[PDB]
Structure 1
Amino acid sequence: IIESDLERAEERAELSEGKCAELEEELKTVTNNLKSLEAQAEKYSQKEDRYEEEIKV
């Protein structure tokens, strides 16, 4: 039972590690997509500012 629970504890170490690694990849993916969207939103906020500067002009 204990060996099976070790296999399970280890499986859970692997599953939770596996999944946390999958989340690291999902996290990096959404972080990179966030950075892209943030950079995009920022490029737009910068364009908004360029226009705002030009709007004011």
Structure 2
Amino acid sequence: LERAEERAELSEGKCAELEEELKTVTNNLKSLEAQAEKYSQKEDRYEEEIKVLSD
């Protein structure tokens, strides 16, 4: 039980660590979703600067 509880604690430790990493990565995912979209928009703002400059 102590070892199983220890495993629960170690696994919970990992669970929490992964959760923290999950959230960090997910938060990065979200900032990156925002960046991938802002960047796709920049891909267009810059493409537009090229089109405008081309004109």
Task: Please classify the TM superposition score into its range, dividing by the shorter chain length.
Answer: 0.7 to 0.9
Match of 1:20 in 2: 15
Q: Where does the alignment leave 5 or more consecutive residues of structure 2 unmatched?
A: none
| TM-score, reference length from structure 2 | 0.73
How many residues align? The count is 52
Q: Give the CA deviation at 1:9.
A: 0.2
| Runs (4+) off by over 2 Å | 49-57
Q: Where does the alignment leave 5 or more consecutive residues of structure 1 unmatched?
A: 1-5
Identity %: 100
| TM-score, reference length from structure 1 | 0.71
Q: Give the CA deviation at 1:51.
A: 4.3
CA RMSD of superposed structures (Å): 1.7
Q: Give the CA deviation at 1:50.
A: 3.6
